[PDB]
Amino acid sequence: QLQFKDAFWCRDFTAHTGYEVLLQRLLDGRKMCKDMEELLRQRAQAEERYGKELVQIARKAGGQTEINSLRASFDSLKQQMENVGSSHIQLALTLREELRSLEEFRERQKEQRKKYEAVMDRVQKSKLSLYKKAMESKKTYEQKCRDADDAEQAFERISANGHQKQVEKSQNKARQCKDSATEAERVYRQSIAQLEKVRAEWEQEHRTTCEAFQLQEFDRLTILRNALWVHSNQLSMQCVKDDELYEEVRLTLEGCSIDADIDSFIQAKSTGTEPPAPVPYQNYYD
Template identity: 50%
Template sequence: SSRSVLRGTDLTSTVGYDSIIQHLNDGRKNCKEFEDFLKERAIIEEKYGKELINLSKKKPCGQTELNTLKRSLDVFKQQIDNVGQGHIQLAQTLREEAKKMEEFREKQKLHRKKIELIMEAIHKNRNLQYKKTMEAKRLYEQRCRDKDEAEQAVHRNANLVTQKQQEKLFLKLAQTKSALEDSDRSYQQSITALEKIREEWMKEHIKACEFFETQECERISYFRGALWLHVNQLSQGCVQNDEKYEEIRKSLEMCSIEKDIDFFVNLRKTGSSAPAPVVYENYYNTQRNATPVRSPVSVPISR
C-alpha cells in the first residue's frame, strides 16, 4: 500500500523499491525451497514404498506355518505390500503438490514482471529528467555568476575605461542577462517536466506497492495452506496405514492355537492306534520251535 513508500531526500534513490523487490524474491526462493523439499520427500517415500513391497514379496516370513496362523501371515504380508503401495501413492501426491507450487510461483513471477517493467521504465525516465534538470540548474547558476561578474566589471571600470570599452562591457552584460534569461527559462521548464514525471512515478510506485502487497499476502496464504495440506496428507497416510495394520490385528484375533495343532495332527497323522509293544523272545526256544531236531550221525574214526 501507500504506506510502503519509503521517503528520502534523493529523488533518484530506489532503496525502498529495491528492498521490496528483494523481499519478494526471497519469498519466491522460499517457495522454491519448499517445492524442492516436497520433491525430495517424494523420492524418500517412493524408495521406502518399493523397499516394503520387495520385502513383503521376496523375504520369507513363516512360510511353513499352517492354517489360521498361516492366514494371518498372508494378511500381514499383503498389508505390508499395501502400506508400500500407499507410500508410493503419497510420493505421487507430493510431486503433484510440488508442481502446483511451481505453477503458483511462475504465475506470480509473470504478473510481477509486468509491474517491474513499468517501474523500470519510470525510474529510467525520472532519472534521466533529474539529470537534465540538475544540468540546467548548474548552467543557470553559472549564468547568474556570469551576469554578476559582468555587472561588477561595469561598475568597477565605469570611470577607468574609454567609451568604446564601456560599450563592450555593457554589451557583455546584456549578453549575460540574455543567457541568464534563457537558462532560467530552461531550468524552470526542466523543473516543471521533472515534477510531472515525479508525480507519475509516485502514482505508479504506490500502485506497484499495493500490487506487491497483495501478491505477498497471496503467497504467504498459499505457502501456509500448502504446509497445512502437506501435514494433513502425512497424517492421512498414518491413519490409512493403521487401518491396514488393524486388518492384521483382526486376522490375529481369529488365529487359534488349538485349531492349528489339530490341523497339523490331522494333516500328518499316521494311524489311529499306537504300535504294539515289542515282547521278549527267547532265541533258543524260538529256534527249537522253528527247526526240527535231527538224530546225530555216527562218524567212524580212523585209526
C-alpha cells in the same frame, strides 16, 4: 494498519531503497518457495523408495510351510505390507502433485514480477536522468545570473566618466549577458517542468507497484501456509490409512486359536490311533 505504499518511501530524491527492499523480499520469497518445493521432492523420493521396499519384502517373504490360522495370519501380514507399500507409492504421487502446484505458482509470480520490474526500472532511470539535467541547468542558470550581474556592474562603473566608445562596449555586452541569463532561466524552468512530470509518474508507479508486491506476498504466504497444512494432513492421513491396514492383521489374529491349529494338523496328518501289536511266538505245528 500497515501497507507497502505508505511505508517504503525515501526522503532522498535520488534513492530508491524502498523499492529495492521490496524487490529483495520477493526474491527471498521465491527462494523460500523453492525450498518448500525441494522438501516435497525429496520427501516424495523417500516415500517412493520406502513404498517399493515394503512391497518387495511382502512379495518375496516366505511362510509356505505353515498351515491353518498361523499361515493365514502371516499371509495377512504380507498382504497388508504390500497395501502399505503401495499406499506410500500413492503418497509420493500426491506430494509430487503438490510440488507441481507450487512450481507453477512460483513461475506465475515471476512473470508478473518481471513486468513491474521493467516499468519501475524505466521510470526510475528517467527520474534520475532528468534530475541530473535539472541540476546541470540550475548550475548554468546560476552562473549566467552571476555573469549578468558582473557585466552590469562593469557597465555602471565605466558609465560615469569613461569614453563613449568604451561605455557603449560594456552596455552591449551587459545586454548580451543578461539575455543569456534569461535563456538559461527558461531552460532551467523547462528542466524543472520535465522533472516534475516524471516524478509524479514515478510516485504513481511506486504506489502501484507496492500494492501489487503486497498482494504477491499475501498470496505467497497464504499458499505456502496452506501447503504446510495440507502436507501435514496428508502425512497424518497416511498414519490413519496404515493403522487401518495393520488392523486387518490383528483381525486375522483374533481367529487364530492355538488349540484349533493343533487339532487341524492331527486330523489332517494322523497315521494311526492304535500302537502295533506285539510279535508273538508262533508254533509251526499248532
